[PDB]
Design an enzyme around this catalytic site. Structure first.
Site, PDB file in Angstrom:
ATOM      1  N   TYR A   1       0.767  -1.333   0.043  1.00  0.00           N
ATOM      2  CA  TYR A   1       0.086   0.055   0.022  1.00  0.00           C
ATOM      3  C   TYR A   1       0.768   1.217   0.087  1.00  0.00           C
ATOM      4  CZ  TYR A   1      -4.224  -2.676   0.891  1.00  0.00           C
ATOM      5  OH  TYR A   1      -5.273  -3.566   0.460  1.00  0.00           O
TER       6      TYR A   1
ATOM      7  N   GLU B   1      -8.178  -6.751   6.129  1.00  0.00           N
ATOM      8  CA  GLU B   1      -7.240  -7.759   5.507  1.00  0.00           C
ATOM      9  C   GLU B   1      -6.402  -8.524   6.400  1.00  0.00           C
ATOM     10  OE1 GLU B   1      -7.586  -5.325   1.343  1.00  0.00           O
ATOM     11  OE2 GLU B   1      -5.539  -5.424   2.252  1.00  0.00           O
TER      12      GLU B   1
ATOM     13  N   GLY C   1     -22.453 -22.029 -18.101  1.00  0.00           N
ATOM     14  CA  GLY C   1     -21.134 -22.485 -18.319  1.00  0.00           C
ATOM     15  C   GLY C   1     -20.379 -22.877 -16.959  1.00  0.00           C
TER      16      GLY C   1
ATOM     17  N   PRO D   1     -19.212 -22.426  -8.230  1.00  0.00           N
ATOM     18  CA  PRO D   1     -19.740 -22.019  -6.891  1.00  0.00           C
ATOM     19  C   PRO D   1     -20.914 -22.686  -6.601  1.00  0.00           C
ATOM     20  CG  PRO D   1     -19.589 -20.020  -8.182  1.00  0.00           C
ATOM     21  CD  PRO D   1     -19.307 -21.198  -8.903  1.00  0.00           C
TER      22      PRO D   1
ATOM     23  N   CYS E   1     -19.212 -12.249  -9.960  1.00  0.00           N
ATOM     24  CA  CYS E   1     -18.512 -11.891 -11.454  1.00  0.00           C
ATOM     25  C   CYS E   1     -17.150 -12.647 -11.340  1.00  0.00           C
ATOM     26  CB  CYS E   1     -18.351 -10.504 -11.689  1.00  0.00           C
ATOM     27  SG  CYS E   1     -19.728  -9.380 -11.416  1.00  0.00           S
ATOM     28  N   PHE E   2     -16.837 -13.205 -12.630  1.00  0.00           N
ATOM     29  CA  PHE E   2     -15.523 -14.040 -12.609  1.00  0.00           C
ATOM     30  C   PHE E   2     -14.506 -12.966 -13.070  1.00  0.00           C
ATOM     31  CE2 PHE E   2     -17.153 -17.391 -10.882  1.00  0.00           C
ATOM     32  CZ  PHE E   2     -16.955 -18.675 -11.660  1.00  0.00           C
TER      33      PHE E   2
HETATM   34  C1  FAD Z   1     -14.241 -14.894  -7.789  1.00  0.00           C
HETATM   35  C2  FAD Z   1     -13.861 -15.571  -8.915  1.00  0.00           C
HETATM   36  C3  FAD Z   1     -13.981 -17.030  -9.181  1.00  0.00           C
HETATM   37  C4  FAD Z   1     -13.630 -17.457 -10.386  1.00  0.00           C
HETATM   38  N1  FAD Z   1     -13.940 -19.024 -10.332  1.00  0.00           N
HETATM   39  C5  FAD Z   1     -13.407 -19.794 -11.519  1.00  0.00           C
HETATM   40  C6  FAD Z   1     -13.762 -21.193 -11.719  1.00  0.00           C
HETATM   41  O1  FAD Z   1     -14.314 -21.749 -10.685  1.00  0.00           O
HETATM   42  N2  FAD Z   1     -13.263 -21.580 -12.976  1.00  0.00           N
HETATM   43  C7  FAD Z   1     -12.811 -21.132 -13.948  1.00  0.00           C
HETATM   44  O2  FAD Z   1     -12.682 -21.670 -15.124  1.00  0.00           O
HETATM   45  N3  FAD Z   1     -12.612 -19.853 -13.979  1.00  0.00           N
HETATM   46  C8  FAD Z   1     -12.847 -19.089 -12.799  1.00  0.00           C
HETATM   47  N4  FAD Z   1     -12.493 -17.766 -12.847  1.00  0.00           N
HETATM   48  C9  FAD Z   1     -11.860 -17.136 -13.714  1.00  0.00           C
HETATM   49  C10 FAD Z   1     -10.501 -17.538 -13.733  1.00  0.00           C
HETATM   50  O3  FAD Z   1      -9.965 -16.887 -12.454  1.00  0.00           O
HETATM   51  C11 FAD Z   1      -9.896 -16.655 -14.560  1.00  0.00           C
HETATM   52  O4  FAD Z   1     -10.354 -15.635 -15.570  1.00  0.00           O
HETATM   53  C12 FAD Z   1      -8.905 -17.529 -15.637  1.00  0.00           C
HETATM   54  O5  FAD Z   1      -8.394 -18.705 -15.122  1.00  0.00           O
HETATM   55  C13 FAD Z   1      -8.216 -16.709 -16.561  1.00  0.00           C
HETATM   56  O6  FAD Z   1      -7.258 -17.635 -16.672  1.00  0.00           O
HETATM   57  P1  FAD Z   1      -6.162 -17.368 -18.115  1.00  0.00           P
HETATM   58  O7  FAD Z   1      -5.105 -18.410 -17.497  1.00  0.00           O
HETATM   59  O8  FAD Z   1      -6.880 -18.358 -18.862  1.00  0.00           O
HETATM   60  O9  FAD Z   1      -6.140 -16.340 -18.756  1.00  0.00           O
HETATM   61  P2  FAD Z   1      -5.633 -14.912 -19.133  1.00  0.00           P
HETATM   62  O10 FAD Z   1      -4.646 -14.641 -19.922  1.00  0.00           O
HETATM   63  O11 FAD Z   1      -6.128 -14.128 -17.856  1.00  0.00           O
HETATM   64  O12 FAD Z   1      -6.950 -14.866 -20.055  1.00  0.00           O
HETATM   65  C14 FAD Z   1      -8.165 -14.359 -19.777  1.00  0.00           C
HETATM   66  C15 FAD Z   1      -9.018 -15.059 -20.744  1.00  0.00           C
HETATM   67  O13 FAD Z   1     -10.489 -14.892 -20.747  1.00  0.00           O
HETATM   68  C16 FAD Z   1     -11.208 -14.819 -21.884  1.00  0.00           C
HETATM   69  N5  FAD Z   1     -12.516 -13.813 -21.784  1.00  0.00           N
HETATM   70  C17 FAD Z   1     -13.566 -14.450 -22.191  1.00  0.00           C
HETATM   71  N6  FAD Z   1     -14.677 -13.771 -22.053  1.00  0.00           N
HETATM   72  C18 FAD Z   1     -14.091 -12.587 -21.320  1.00  0.00           C
HETATM   73  C19 FAD Z   1     -14.840 -11.434 -20.876  1.00  0.00           C
HETATM   74  N7  FAD Z   1     -16.046 -11.137 -20.943  1.00  0.00           N
HETATM   75  N8  FAD Z   1     -13.700 -10.764 -20.344  1.00  0.00           N
HETATM   76  C20 FAD Z   1     -12.366 -10.727 -20.139  1.00  0.00           C
HETATM   77  N9  FAD Z   1     -11.640 -11.795 -20.528  1.00  0.00           N
HETATM   78  C21 FAD Z   1     -12.779 -12.886 -20.988  1.00  0.00           C
HETATM   79  C22 FAD Z   1     -10.113 -14.148 -22.922  1.00  0.00           C
HETATM   80  O14 FAD Z   1     -10.221 -13.814 -24.223  1.00  0.00           O
HETATM   81  C23 FAD Z   1      -8.564 -14.680 -22.363  1.00  0.00           C
HETATM   82  O15 FAD Z   1      -8.474 -15.927 -23.015  1.00  0.00           O
HETATM   83  C24 FAD Z   1     -12.893 -17.046 -11.253  1.00  0.00           C
HETATM   84  C25 FAD Z   1     -12.693 -15.359 -11.119  1.00  0.00           C
HETATM   85  C26 FAD Z   1     -13.141 -14.890 -10.121  1.00  0.00           C
HETATM   86  C27 FAD Z   1     -12.748 -13.418 -10.219  1.00  0.00           C
HETATM   87  C1  HEM Z   2      -6.671   1.591  -0.953  1.00  0.00           C
HETATM   88  C2  HEM Z   2      -6.424   1.057  -2.550  1.00  0.00           C
HETATM   89  C3  HEM Z   2      -6.841   0.042  -3.101  1.00  0.00           C
HETATM   90  C4  HEM Z   2      -8.140  -0.079  -3.578  1.00  0.00           C
HETATM   91  C5  HEM Z   2      -9.212   1.108  -3.366  1.00  0.00           C
HETATM   92  C6  HEM Z   2      -7.926  -1.113  -4.328  1.00  0.00           C
HETATM   93  C7  HEM Z   2      -9.343  -1.473  -5.320  1.00  0.00           C
HETATM   94  C8  HEM Z   2      -9.256  -2.504  -6.074  1.00  0.00           C
HETATM   95  C9  HEM Z   2     -10.166  -2.907  -6.901  1.00  0.00           C
HETATM   96  C10 HEM Z   2     -11.671  -2.221  -7.182  1.00  0.00           C
HETATM   97  C11 HEM Z   2     -10.134  -4.076  -7.676  1.00  0.00           C
HETATM   98  C12 HEM Z   2     -11.199  -4.709  -8.632  1.00  0.00           C
HETATM   99  C13 HEM Z   2     -11.860  -5.653  -7.628  1.00  0.00           C
HETATM  100  C14 HEM Z   2     -12.733  -6.636  -8.415  1.00  0.00           C
HETATM  101  O1  HEM Z   2     -12.395  -7.847  -8.988  1.00  0.00           O
HETATM  102  O2  HEM Z   2     -13.917  -6.899  -7.952  1.00  0.00           O
HETATM  103  C15 HEM Z   2      -8.591  -4.604  -7.130  1.00  0.00           C
HETATM  104  C16 HEM Z   2      -8.109  -5.527  -7.781  1.00  0.00           C
HETATM  105  C17 HEM Z   2      -6.576  -5.751  -7.431  1.00  0.00           C
HETATM  106  N1  HEM Z   2      -5.790  -5.137  -6.473  1.00  0.00           N
HETATM  107 FE1  HEM Z   2      -6.531  -3.673  -5.371  1.00  0.00          FE
HETATM  108  N2  HEM Z   2      -6.891  -1.931  -4.501  1.00  0.00           N
HETATM  109  C18 HEM Z   2      -6.100  -1.290  -3.682  1.00  0.00           C
HETATM  110  C19 HEM Z   2      -4.673  -1.425  -3.368  1.00  0.00           C
HETATM  111  C20 HEM Z   2      -4.007  -2.554  -3.695  1.00  0.00           C
HETATM  112  C21 HEM Z   2      -2.519  -2.601  -3.535  1.00  0.00           C
HETATM  113  C22 HEM Z   2      -1.687  -1.925  -2.742  1.00  0.00           C
HETATM  114  C23 HEM Z   2      -2.193  -3.824  -4.367  1.00  0.00           C
HETATM  115  C24 HEM Z   2      -1.030  -4.246  -4.263  1.00  0.00           C
HETATM  116  C25 HEM Z   2       0.118  -4.111  -5.295  1.00  0.00           C
HETATM  117  C26 HEM Z   2      -3.535  -4.246  -5.179  1.00  0.00           C
HETATM  118  C27 HEM Z   2      -3.613  -5.129  -5.936  1.00  0.00           C
HETATM  119  C28 HEM Z   2      -4.582  -5.581  -6.692  1.00  0.00           C
HETATM  120  C29 HEM Z   2      -4.584  -6.833  -7.698  1.00  0.00           C
HETATM  121  C30 HEM Z   2      -3.289  -7.651  -7.729  1.00  0.00           C
HETATM  122  C31 HEM Z   2      -5.817  -6.892  -8.040  1.00  0.00           C
HETATM  123  C32 HEM Z   2      -6.348  -7.782  -8.962  1.00  0.00           C
HETATM  124  C33 HEM Z   2      -5.800  -7.379 -10.550  1.00  0.00           C
HETATM  125  C34 HEM Z   2      -5.441  -8.444 -11.409  1.00  0.00           C
HETATM  126  O3  HEM Z   2      -6.008  -9.510 -11.308  1.00  0.00           O
HETATM  127  O4  HEM Z   2      -4.486  -8.052 -12.196  1.00  0.00           O
HETATM  128  N3  HEM Z   2      -4.665  -3.255  -4.784  1.00  0.00           N
HETATM  129  N4  HEM Z   2      -8.182  -3.486  -6.218  1.00  0.00           N
HETATM  130 NA    NA Z   3     -21.453 -26.281 -18.653  1.00  0.00          NA
END
Ligand code: FAD
Ligand code: HEM
Ligand code: NA
Ligand code: FAD
Ligand code: FAD
Ligand code: FAD
Ligand code: HEM
Ligand code: HEM
Ligand code: HEM
Ligand code: CL
Ligand code: CL
Ligand code: CL
Ligand code: CL
Ligand code: NA
Ligand code: NA
Ligand code: NA
Ligand code: NA
Ligand code: NA
Ligand code: NA
Ligand code: NA
EC number: 1.14.12.17
Lengths: 396, 396, 396, 396
Positions: free
Chosen positions: A95, A135, A268, A273, A389-390
């Site tokens: 942070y 946290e 899908g 969950p 949302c995923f």
């Molecule tokens: C709370 C939470 C729970 C999850 N639970 C599961 C789970 O149980 N099973 C599971 O398979 N995944 C789940 N996911 C999603 C998963 O974490 C990842 O998005 C995923 O594994 C992406 O992996 P990556 O290695 O393929 O790709 P990255 O390189 O990050 O690729 C993301 C990919 O998503 C594709 N994509 C398709 N539609 C979209 C869209 N609308 N927006 C953005 N990208 C899109 C892109 O084309 C790309 O191939 C969850 C995510 C969250 C936040």
């Molecule tokens: C007070 C400050 C912060 C706020 C308000 C904040 C807010 C958020 C929000 C809105 C998201 C998206 C949540 C969603 O998926 O629903 C997120 C994702 C995330 N945040 Fe924070 N964040 C903060 C600080 C930090 C810090 C210090 C780090 C550390 C380097 C961090 C790292 C991440 C990462 C890694 C993700 C996931 C994005 C990814 O997958 O690439 N955040 N945060």
């Molecule tokens: Na299915």
């Protein structure tokens, strides 16, 4: 402990911040990754990403820090983000880093003078402390539970099962042979990976798919075309390989009594969950009605239909309905689905006239907004609808 | 979403509120219990109470509501109170009641005009929503866990064991024969009672004394002279009787890794959360040093010394030390204690030179402040010391 | 013609607008689609969408309308959006609709009084007129060209060719047998569709893949899992079917002289605008160096490698390099690729020491930011790098 | 990004600027041409000029820069000027030059102090960036098209044809033998010339007279008594000579559908853009009514009557009417005209009761205002009337 002026100084700079929207964010992340490249091991660096997670993080800091007085109303969004940060193991030192880059970017882009930068430093600080405090509680809760742990823990892949042409489940068991934490159906795991082809360590969230058993976990992954982690898990990961996991977290879970009717809607892989929720209801002998509404593209890609059947059979009041958006000829000849096309609940046989029914939703954003709006059009109160949302968090 | 003026209107009325201190509080509770007597079933009505819980509740509303802008710093105190409210099953409707009586008392006592009463209504409302939101999350977490439940659940007393002249343990098992929720060592249960001699239903918090087992719970109660609930449990409650329980809650618990040395300090019945912590460490094969420092008045009143011995024997690095403040002649002839007098850690054989050691404390306030100050005088950082009061929350 | 006060009234309400971020947007779209459902025929209603286009539209109106005085700096973003609106055939009446819902939402959510709503109505109006004016010029330019047209025009699918396991090209020719408009390599077409299974009419943008020939167009579509329009085009559309097209638009195109070295970088289907650019250079006998850097997942999914080869062969100075991120065994045995893994330009044989070289990029956001940052790290000026997103516009 | 004060500082100096009207302008151009004589190669230096283009340029900078906040309403005038600048190849460096001379003149004439000069420098800068941005887009569009080019291109005069005693057409074909850009009927070319008798390079705009064919262009020039460029083209230029051209630009063009009735009104050489429009309609088989109303002084000076006849003959619904203002005796004996005197549409056989009819006008200012006012007096809406001046832009 802020005062009126600091708060007004930050809000007065907000109009200057929204008109620089995208530029600003880019300058902030370009400065972060240049001076603190180690953060590339925590943020997603895949060439397949779309940049939404970055955009949302920065916008939240700007919007939350400037209305820190009204934090009370932000707590539900803070909880959702705090739970997610816990999987990425965000720490207090980080942070500080994000704070240095935020103020340095403000200065570099505008040269606002010390008063403005000090104000933003105080408002951000208060906001960062709110997240650090919550946290820290969650990390403590996760390490206090039985089978719980701090940080990352090693887990061996003990089983790799293809459940459809696009989904494969992976069973995981601690390498230390000890108990694993329990969780609330609907929660997820933080999977840290860095096989040898990865240029950076990637962290992904995968939902838990069954009732907790204190022994291991089972995740189901959909192979996303071009996705870095899902393609490695599907094409290279093997039973025997070890990955690192972070305890289960998440604010989306099922909390019902035995007489609470429940409806599980999903499209899908968004059914992951829901499987944990259905398994939990079945093992508890849930007496109230339980519905399983699912939509898959076709039979080739539809996974877990057999498990869902055996689980519902074990329940007293269970009803399942599947919609195939684009059934193949073979699918039509097998009749393994109920209706074809989009999930049109309005045409189901009988509505949910139970005001106490709880609905859980999980699929893409359009699917959840289309399906949640059908429910309120039918009279379902909004506080009885829950979803996840995923990708970044959205709203309808 | 408050503004500067409302906030200044509330803070401007604070000096008028502190000089009416006790009068004000009395008028507020007298008006509450007159118009909302049903709350007598939730607050402690025992003739043995001292009135601290009432005093603290009202003072917190006045101090928190007037500095609602700085809520961020209040969140750790909000969490502690929210966890406790959950045992008393506080609900949103009751916040409305407390709000009506607060503003009506302000008017009745001062006749401040509508502007002031509106301001206080808005600041209180924001504060009440903060608690309602966090308490809704906790209720949900408790009902989502396995063996978890909403509200009150019936539990039969399956075993009553006298562990000393003042302490008796009670084993409890759900009347429904189902699983019971897990918890974090150091947490407590909400026990609702109203045998036929009680004029009102009383609710008390009793710590869980062993590692969770998903089957039942074991609480240990000290008989307080004149205490309503402890004397009923000791003199009238019998194996076979049914009481109501509220899921486990509490912000004080042990969260350590396997290599984290731990020290458990306690006086008298304050050892109950420590027993749950010691049982958890023993069953996990904790490898780092584990200390058990306990002080009892004498051997007659000292409970659980045999259990603590068998548990420490199962640990690799365990050290126990007991202090009897007023050993009897028989106690001296049996030699069942280490030192006599107050717990003087400074004279133990070897200090805790481990900066990573975590210390948990639980006894009366003077005992914990005397024992926590010895620890920092020895160099122990304050963030490594944790404690819990069996009465309103204090600080040293 | 706004004045200082109106402008300050809108900027003063911006802090109130960013803290309601997502709620606000949802209320605005829920009110729009309820009273003006016909807009569902223009916005994407697919259950596979993620909601970014909606979010960006609303945020732009809030950020642009509040800094309408500084419109000058917004013109490059206005042009990009105006070109896109032209494919969706946005009209002045629709701006009135969006304006009524914006002000009604502001009132419904805050009840700001008439002064505030009037200010927002004036600032929005000025902003809407800027877009209406530029979009009227573009519609006029499109209908004035030879083969150009107003609105939508019918086109028959005259050829359907599978170019890989995921990409299929579709040749289109006007049903009227007349000439078709010319365009600037890198531009796209607006494809309006509503086969009988669609609940709503969907509009998608597909890039033009070859040099203009005044006879027909050729688009190449990637089948997105669950994608509504791409799956209909791949599984149901047939040669003979008729779709509606809107003239070519877009602000991303290639503008070079004969001696301007060019580099075309692309990943997957993002190569579609690059093909139009390569075909244009080849048919013009481009004398300066032309590079074709492409990354595909594997050989199964890699499309157009044969066309790119024959086109480069026709050029004097041409160099092609392909990277397969996850080559299959068969791919390695055929050797149809240069390097495996991510596109690492830094390891190519020779850099682009030509300061006059122009670079075009097109793939996912992570790919373009990773590849554009490699270029500036090598010394390439930012004004020589051009790129386009197949989703909302981003920045790095 | 300007602020209220800068904007008020510039508007406060406007009354001081309008009362110095002509003096000011002269001082500005005298200072420009002294220190930056190279601009004499871009501005018209003919001894036959009247000084209107200079006057309009300076007045626009003063009026636009001082109301830069209301730029939105100025965009249609900015587009018209930006298109014209593109033919003169105006560049960003030249905006710097004009900015230095503007502020230096303000200082030299008034000595307003730094605050005023800084304000004017900021307002001008914003205005100059608006033009630079739009002109950069147009240059890019022109070089991206097929047959398009950047800058100046050499073209050989391949045909010189006398069409009347005052008008001679010149066919031009690229010296490089390549394709030439397409254009929108009604647009013009930038012709750069500097034969050996010219003391300076002169640039003139000549309309394109036929439908585009990707091979060459055809311009028709009227010999103006004393005109520098038209007399060189008529008396010295020969087939074989090479001139330089700048791609086609212009905001005045025809944009109609096939069923849009069109009326082309013109006097003398103002018929040149109309010829391109008529040729385009004829080659497209336009089905709706097409009118050709033209006025020439007499038959000696009337050009293209034979081409217009053959083109209208090819159309389904075509009507032509010619007015000779001063018919000679020979003209009356040949009867090659319809009516004598001014163009009195009000006395034609039948009005244009078609609300969808579009009217294009091109002649001297008095002619267009006289003819456009006849049309609205007949009921024609103003938005259906379009016109272009062969001199600075005027309004009626
Ligand atoms: C709370 C939470 C729970 C999850 N639970 C599961 C789970 O149980 N099973 C599971 O398979 N995944 C789940 N996911 C999603 C998963 O974490 C990842 O998005 C995923 O594994 C992406 O992996 P990556 O290695 O393929 O790709 P990255 O390189 O990050 O690729 C993301 C990919 O998503 C594709 N994509 C398709 N539609 C979209 C869209 N609308 N927006 C953005 N990208 C899109 C892109 O084309 C790309 O191939 C969850 C995510 C969250 C936040
Ligand atoms: C007070 C400050 C912060 C706020 C308000 C904040 C807010 C958020 C929000 C809105 C998201 C998206 C949540 C969603 O998926 O629903 C997120 C994702 C995330 N945040 Fe924070 N964040 C903060 C600080 C930090 C810090 C210090 C780090 C550390 C380097 C961090 C790292 C991440 C990462 C890694 C993700 C996931 C994005 C990814 O997958 O690439 N955040 N945060
Ligand atoms: Na299915
Ligand atoms: C988080 C928490 C955990 C707890 N865990 C346990 C536990 O594991 N075991 C257990 O036996 N109790 C525990 N307690 C305390 C317990 O909940 C009650 O105080 C108790 O049961 C009081 O019961 P009652 O029926 O006797 O009396 P009441 O009528 O409420 O009487 C309270 C009594 O305490 C006496 N008393 C003695 N010292 C004090 C003092 N310093 N301040 C106030 N009153 C004092 C009074 O004289 C009186 O008899 C816990 C309390 C909290 C808040
Ligand atoms: C200027 C422009 C030019 C384009 N040119 C082409 C082209 O030449 N060829 C072509 O095939 N497409 C092109 N596209 C993209 C294309 O217009 C659409 O996104 C596409 O056809 C979506 O179609 P749909 O019918 O499948 O799905 P929708 O139902 O809208 O589905 C969108 C889909 O994309 C998936 N997806 C994968 N990654 C992401 C991500 N990162 N973010 C969001 N969704 C993701 C989703 O999972 C889902 O299946 C262009 C887009 C733009 C804006
Ligand atoms: C958009 C545009 C399109 C044009 N298209 C054509 C075209 O297709 N054909 C064509 O022949 N010309 C066209 N012109 C006009 C043309 O560009 C020039 O004015 C012309 O070539 C002047 O040339 P020059 O060499 O004779 O004279 P200069 O030395 O600049 O002389 C200008 C001359 O115009 C005379 N003149 C007559 N009436 C006026 C008047 N009302 N105001 C000012 N001067 C007047 C002067 O007496 C003088 O001889 C166009 C102009 C514009 C701005
Ligand atoms: C926003 C308002 C509230 C605040 C700030 C607040 C604060 C507190 C505090 C400081 C305590 C003592 C905590 C301690 O033991 O450590 C407490 C106890 C308690 N509160 Fe709350 N409280 C609030 C509202 C309520 C409401 C609405 C009720 C419901 C009727 C309630 C019922 C109780 C009860 C029963 C106790 C235990 C006291 C006893 O044992 O008699 N509180 N509260
Ligand atoms: C002055 C107001 C407007 C602004 C500032 C604006 C801004 C935007 C922005 C930022 C985007 C995303 C651009 C991107 O993809 O790069 C967009 C997309 C879009 N806009 Fe506009 N817009 C406005 C008015 C309108 C109106 C009146 C309509 C008509 C109903 C409209 C319909 C659309 C559509 C359909 C999309 C595509 C989204 C989709 O695919 O679902 N916009 N607009
Ligand atoms: C922001 C500043 C500018 C504005 C507002 C502006 C405005 C104008 C206007 C109103 C006209 C007459 C348009 C008409 O024929 O309809 C014009 C013509 C012209 N402008 Fe600009 N202009 C600006 C900057 C420049 C610059 C930097 C140059 C470069 C040296 C330039 C060179 C010209 C030329 C050569 C003409 C044609 C006049 C001739 O034929 O002699 N302008 N401009
Ligand atoms: Cl991202
Ligand atoms: Cl009390
Ligand atoms: Cl969307
Ligand atoms: Cl002039
Ligand atoms: Na990473
Ligand atoms: Na009570
Ligand atoms: Na004891
Ligand atoms: Na649609
Ligand atoms: Na490909
Ligand atoms: Na000149
Ligand atoms: Na003529």
């Amino acid at each position: 402990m802020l005062d009126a002026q600091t708060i007004a100084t930050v809000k007065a700079t907000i109009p200057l911040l929204v008109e620089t929207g995208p530029k600003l964010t880019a300058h902030f992340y370009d400065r972060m990754f240049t001076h603190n490249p180690e953060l590339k091991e925590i943020f997603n660096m895949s060439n397949q990403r779309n940049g939404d997670q970055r955009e949302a993080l920065f916008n939240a800091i700007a919007a939350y820090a400037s209305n820190i007085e009204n934090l009370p109303a932000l707590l539900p969004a803070v909880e959702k983000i705090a739970q997610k940060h816990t999987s990425f193991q965000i720490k207090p030192e980080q942070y500080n880093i994000v704070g240095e880059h935020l103020l340095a970017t403000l200065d570099e882009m505008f040269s606002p003078g010390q008063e403005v930068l000090d104000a933003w430093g105080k408002a951000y600080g208060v906001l960062a402390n709110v997240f650090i405090n919550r946290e820290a509680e969650i990390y403590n809760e996760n390490a206090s539970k039985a089978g719980g742990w701090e940080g990352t823990r090693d887990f061996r892949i003990v089983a790799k099962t293809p459940r459809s042409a696009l989904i494969t489940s992976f069973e995981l068991e601690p390498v230390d042979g000890g108990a694993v934490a329990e969780y609330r159906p609907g929660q997820y795991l933080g999977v840290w990976l860095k096989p040898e082809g990865f240029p950076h360590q990637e962290i992904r969230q995968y939902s838990l798919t069954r009732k907790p058993d204190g022994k291991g976990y089972r995740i189901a992954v959909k192979r996303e075309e071009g996705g870095q982690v899902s393609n490695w898990l599907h094409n290279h990961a093997n039973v025997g390989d070890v990955v690192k996991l972070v305890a289960p977290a998440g604010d989306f879970f099922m909390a019902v009594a035995d007489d609470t009717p429940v409806t599980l809607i999903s499209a899908g892989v968004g059914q992951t969950p829901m499987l944990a929720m259905l398994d939990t209801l079945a093992k508890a002998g849930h007496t109230a009605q339980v519905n399983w509404f699912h939509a898959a593209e076709n039979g080739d890609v539809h996974a877990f239909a057999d498990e869902v059947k055996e689980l519902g059979q074990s329940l007293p009041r269970f009803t399942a309905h599947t919609w195939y958006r684009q059934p193949s000829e073979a699918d039509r000849a097998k009749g393994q689905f109920d209706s074809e096309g989009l999930m049109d609940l309005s045409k189901l046989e009988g509505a949910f006239s139970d005001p106490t029914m709880q609905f859980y939703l999980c699929g893409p954003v359009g699917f959840m907004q289309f399906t949640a709006k059908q429910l309120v059009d039918l009279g379902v109160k909004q506080e009885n609808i829950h979803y996840e949302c995923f990708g970044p968090h959205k709203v309808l």
